[PDB]
Amino acid sequence: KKVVLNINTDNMCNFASYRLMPFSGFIVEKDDRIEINDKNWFDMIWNEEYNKMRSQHDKIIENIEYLFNIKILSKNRIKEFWEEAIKYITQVHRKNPNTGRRNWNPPTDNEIEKLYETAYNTLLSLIKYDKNKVYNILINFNPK
Amino acid sequence: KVVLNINTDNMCNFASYRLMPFSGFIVERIEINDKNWFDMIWNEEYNKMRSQLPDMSHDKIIENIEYLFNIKILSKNRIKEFWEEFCKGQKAAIKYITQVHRKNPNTGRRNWNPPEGDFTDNEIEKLYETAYNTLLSLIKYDKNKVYNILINFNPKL
Amino acid sequence: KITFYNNSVFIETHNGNYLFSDMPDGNVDYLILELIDYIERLKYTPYKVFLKEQREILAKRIISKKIRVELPKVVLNINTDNMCNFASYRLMPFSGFIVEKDDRIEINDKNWFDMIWNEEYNKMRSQIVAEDFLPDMSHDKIIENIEYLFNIKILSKNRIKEFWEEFCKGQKAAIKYITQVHRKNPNTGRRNWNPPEGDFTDNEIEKLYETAYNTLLSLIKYDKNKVYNILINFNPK
Amino acid sequence: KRIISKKIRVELPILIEKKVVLNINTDNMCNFASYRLMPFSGFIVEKDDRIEINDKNWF
Amino acid sequence: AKTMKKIYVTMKTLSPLYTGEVRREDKEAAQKRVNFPVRKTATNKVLIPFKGALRSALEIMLKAKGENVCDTGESRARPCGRCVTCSLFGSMGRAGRASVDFLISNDTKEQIVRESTHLRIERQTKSASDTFKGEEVIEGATFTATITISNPQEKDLSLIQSALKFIEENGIGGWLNKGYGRVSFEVKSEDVATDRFL
Amino acid sequence: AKTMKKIYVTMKTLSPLYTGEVRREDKEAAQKRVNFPVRKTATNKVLIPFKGALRSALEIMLKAKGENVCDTGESRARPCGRCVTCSLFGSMGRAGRASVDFLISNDTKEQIVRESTHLRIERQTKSASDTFKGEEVIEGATFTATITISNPQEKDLSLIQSALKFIEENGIGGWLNKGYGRVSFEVKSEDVATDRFLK
Amino acid sequence: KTMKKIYVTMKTLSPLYTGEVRREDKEAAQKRVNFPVRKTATNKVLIPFKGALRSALEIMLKAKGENVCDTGESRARPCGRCVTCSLFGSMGRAGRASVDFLISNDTKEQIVRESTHLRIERQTKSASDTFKGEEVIEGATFTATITISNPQEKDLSLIQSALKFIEENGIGGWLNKGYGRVSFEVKSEDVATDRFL
RNA sequence: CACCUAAUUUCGAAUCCAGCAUGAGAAGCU
Ligand SMILES: [Zn+2]
Ligand SMILES: [Zn+2]
Ligand SMILES: [Zn+2]
Secondary structure: OEEEEOOOOOOOEEEOOEEEEEEOOEEEEOOOEEEEEOHHHHHHHHHHHHHHHOOOOHHHHHHHHHHHHOOOOOHHHHHHHHOOOHHHHHHHHOOOOOOOOOOOOOOOHHHHHHHHHHHHHHHHHHHHOOOOHHHHHHHOOOOO | OEOOOOOOOOOOOEOOEEOOOOOEEEEOOEEEEOHHHHHHHHHHHHHHOOOOOOOOOHHHHHHHHHHHHHOOOOOHHHHHHHHHHHHOOOOHHHHHHHHHHOOOOOOOOOOOOOOOOOOOHHHHHHHHHHHHHHHHHHHOOOHHHHHHHHHHHOOOO | OEEOOOOOEEEEOOOOEEEEOOOOOOOOOEEEOOHHHHHHOOOOOOOEEEOOOHHHHHHHHHHHOOOEEEOOOEEEEOOOOOOOEOOOOEOOOOEEEEEEOOOEEEEEOHHHHHHHHHHHHHHHHOOOOOOOOOOOOOHHHHHHHHHHHHHOOOOOHHHHHHHHHHHHOOHHHHHHHHHHHOOOOOOOOOOOOOOOOOOOOHHHHHHHHHHHHHHHHHOOOOOHHHHHHHHOOOOOO | OOOOOOOOOOOOOOOOOOEOOOOOOOOOOEEOOOOEEOEEEOEEOEEOOEOOEEOOOOO | OOEEEEEEEEEEEOOOEEOEOOOHHHHHHHOOOOOEOEOEOOOOEEOOOOHHHHHHHHHHHHHHHOOOOOOOOOOOOOOOOOOHHHHHHOOOOOOOOEEEOOOEEOOEHHHHEEEEEEEEEOOOOOOEEEEEEEEEEOOOOEEEEEEEEEOOOOOHHHHHHHHHHHHHHHOOOEOHHHOOOOEEEEEEEEEEEOOOOO | OOEEEEEEEEEEEOOOEOOEOOOHHHHHHHOOOOOEOEOEOOOOOEEEOOHHHHHHHHHHHHHHHOOOOOOOOOOOOOOOOOOOHHHHHOOOOOOOOEEEOOEEEOOOOOOOEEEEEEEEEOOOOOOEEEEEEEEEEOOOOEEEEEEEEOOOOOOHHHHHHHHHHHHHHHOOOOOOOOOOOOEEEEEEEEEEEOOOOOO | OEEEEEEEEEEEOOOEOOEOOEHHHHOOOOOOOOEOEOEOOOOOEOOOOHHHHHHHHHHHHHHOOOOOOOOOOOOOOOOOOOHHHHHHOOOOOOOOEEEOOOEEOOOHHHHEEEEEEEEEOOOOOOEEEEEEEEEEOOOOEEEEEEEEOOOOOOHHHHHHHHHHHHHHHOOOOOHHHOOOOEEEEEEEEEEEOOOOO
16 A cells, blocks of 8 residues: 655654664554554544543621631632532532542631631522622622 | 555554554655664674674464463563563574573573472473473564563563 | 064963963963974973974974874763774774763764663553453442442542543453453452551452452443443542 | 973973864754664774764765 | 842752652653653753742741741642742742742753662561652752842842752652752852843 | 751661662663672662661551551551651651651772672582572661651650661661671761751 | 560581672682681671571471471472471561571681691592681680561470571581581570560 | 692572552632
8 A cells, every 4th residue: 555654754864875764653554545653643643532532698798708808708719600600619618538628718727617618608698699689799899 | 655664563453543653764765664774784884884493383472471471480570581682682582592591511400480380300391491492482573573472471561 | 461472472371371373481381383493492392282284294293393283062972992093093993873962962872772762662562552442230339339449448539530541442441451450469469459448357358359340340331421420429530 | 400401391299171073964863762863873083182083984 | 120149059969869750641651661750851851840949948947937937838828928938939929039940950861860669568577568660860960950039139149048958958859758859059159230141 | 846856877787788779770780790789879879778667667666565556568558647657757648757868878889888699508408509699788887867857756766766776676678587787876866946057 | 566586695616617708808818718707897707597597497397297398499489388488488478587697706816717628639648639718716606686576486496496406417618527516505585576665 | 847739610590569549729910
């Protein structure tokens, strides 16, 4: 079969009048058309096959004032809550069983866990409140 | 033009493409060709500047290496060291296998690992000769075939 | 310090005493050029003179006068000795390799390239493996077995991650991975499993390894959507 | 006094740089294993103060 | 603003040096052979993170001396912007004055990096229960770095040199408790103006 | 915190010391001459692992005493983090406060390193059935290590010294059954400040 | 736990010879002597002790009818189940009985001498060959300590039986010529492992 | 009281193992 180099020949050496080059490419049979392509090629198709396998109320506002005052319920939190939300809030409060690392912000340790719980409560309740009410509530706290 | 100058065997099937990992030399009538060209060219010009095997079947090779691996005549240190001398050429592998197999005239002790079991003297020497003939005939094969043969017995070759 | 003489520059540095060509009185470490008398009249005979072909014949005279004569990235040698003497030239019949780094250029032999070719061969071989890209239990039993081996840390998040990567590469690659992981070593007696936490003996530990083997074997027969919904609960990434 | 009369310097208790000259066209270079190597064919000439590497045309 | 401080750091290893590979692709390529690869360049030279070691040295020393110095070591800890290491190394708003370079080795991986065998031995039967291969940088291998301080102060160099002697005392890189990473630093400082290039 | 303990140990060798070479390329360079190379630096000085010996000594004695100590010697065993040796030598969530340096010889190679011959003899025949060559460290060679305890306690120096006497009793590394590695220790400790470098 | 300490004190009854093993200490000494005695760098005499105990115990336990592995054959593998496998180690475990070297109490200038041995023709009774060897003098005292990690009720008895077999056969080299006959004294004690705390 | 000798040979290899575990986040300016 006809054989085509996809490799770059624009780097060479001259030894014994032979224009040689050490190379580490892969030879591919493709339907009576053989080719020898580089490592990048295999990187690209390994990525393509991986992506193909990958194709499958006043107290609430006062709690937000306290929490944003010590910045545990900060601006990106308010944004990503707006971007949303129950599964999000579940995913940003769940304590890691190995390290005990809740994904909130740092603000005693008992007060820290109470404040963390306070956030989960306030975050869950505000999603209970309808849109616009929370939206307005959240604008003067983080305008975005 | 392309002349591949390599065996197009050992073709695995990643995804829907029959690939085959390779490392060789492109030489310009362009001709991709393997490490044997570099051995030939290196010997040729290195001496031009100095001017002032047994053949046993592949199934029987695999079965005998499996048998000697179970009774610990061939071990992971031996399969790795023989692979290192096989990468150094087909003449260093002959020297290494001859050095391991040889009976020292004063002691009579071959450098193989002794078998594990209840084998008598003639059976032990027959298995030593089996290891010699098997690793001697294995060299007659190419690097990829040698690699697929010994990669089962030693997974970190 | 730069003095003068009859055209002579006499630049003194901290390293060496150059003289570009009356003669001076100090040491003229490097001299740059009847002149033999100009050499012989000059105190502290120079180390190495810096001298169209008549030059070379003159240099032979400078060679005979017992004076060194030169006729007009750091490079290191990783070579041998061998040596030879042909046509008044100490030689070496060697062919090799010029390796270019950021600061050094080194001259290496073919043995270093064989070292590099062995490494590149061993690198290439461990990229393409087999056909990249069974028992059976119920789905809920698979859930409680993965929960139980997660609690006792036999099946960990890293093991679930490599299981998902070997499952995306296909069925046979994942079969090879679990048969490698559950491989009891005949000369050592350990498998490639995380040992469970808890007060256990050898029999229930071996049984738990067997149910880990059977659970990860029976999960392979399921499709990718069920396996993804089975393993996100334990490994969220 | 008698080696000063021989016009050679005497101490009573400079820089010399032994340099390696390449003298080889290194513009034709290739990359194989993150190494800029070139297959090389020449002679290690060892004269004084200069271990010059010289090609086959020099020979 | 008219002057800058140039601190050329030449560090040699008295103990074998390990720092861990960070690139995932390089690390998953390396575990087919070795279990703990050393962090290297794509030009095969060894790289060590350096700003974190100097900053951690200054935080521990300045906290133990008694200055009002914040701690950025804790989880998601915020730099205050008032202490001297907030001014020297970085703040949440103001950038760091010291642009600390990486520790670039002089030699490549074939000269200074060597793969070795580490163990885990049972205490009762005295047998090697586990075994793993890890790369390390050899002893006497030298590394170069450059610390460029813009808007310098009088005491910045004393702080950097004190942090360097603390890194000699503790170690740099990983596996510091087992004896790895003990180093010796040479310092060449200099005043420059910013318009040498002009 | 404000202070750290410095424990300079100077260990002299009484019976020949072997600690095996770890580097695979240094091994493969040295197996053409010596079957058992000694652990060595690139600056031709002898390296000995020290943290594992002290840790294993403390776990063995504190287990025989009956104290709550985990074992980190079984296969893939993880430290709990509540022991006494877990504080000194580390756990999964916390590092060890006692950073233990490698034992590095004051002399170099080719001065304390000596390559020797070892035997295996038939019991019925009394002939040298096997022979190998191993690289040892001579007796009277002096090694220097430092232990930096970051958060010192009252019982750290006593625990370190007790582990040192156990290393004297058992041996430090290598073929400890045959009699190799029997050493003795000299200890000099001081409570240095953490801010001593801040001039 | 407990540990067993057997302090052995060895008095040398006939001459003793253990050859040097270090290459740099033999090839630097072949211009002076032909068989240098095995030494420390602190000028004290070294004798390998674990192998003599192991060889003794394997001979007597093999001839008693119990299953023991023979580690005397070339490239032998210990079984891991026998008594000497438990005491002196095997492949996969280690020796409970760590056996120290036999360190001399004196230097070499006190208890090492340099003898002249011959080889004599049989027909004519003439000194055909001459060689020189360093030997350890008689009554030289050596000391060693056997430390048993997990002791049983039959480790000290087997160690003492191996010591008596060593006094009957000999330790070190040149055993058939009469060299190396010794006398052993044992001080046995049972320490606690946590005793250094 | 002398005198001769003080050398020579074999071996210098073999094997096991090379695994796990954790964490993938958040801030300000904007
Ligand atoms: Zn701060
Ligand atoms: Zn613990
Ligand atoms: Zn046995």
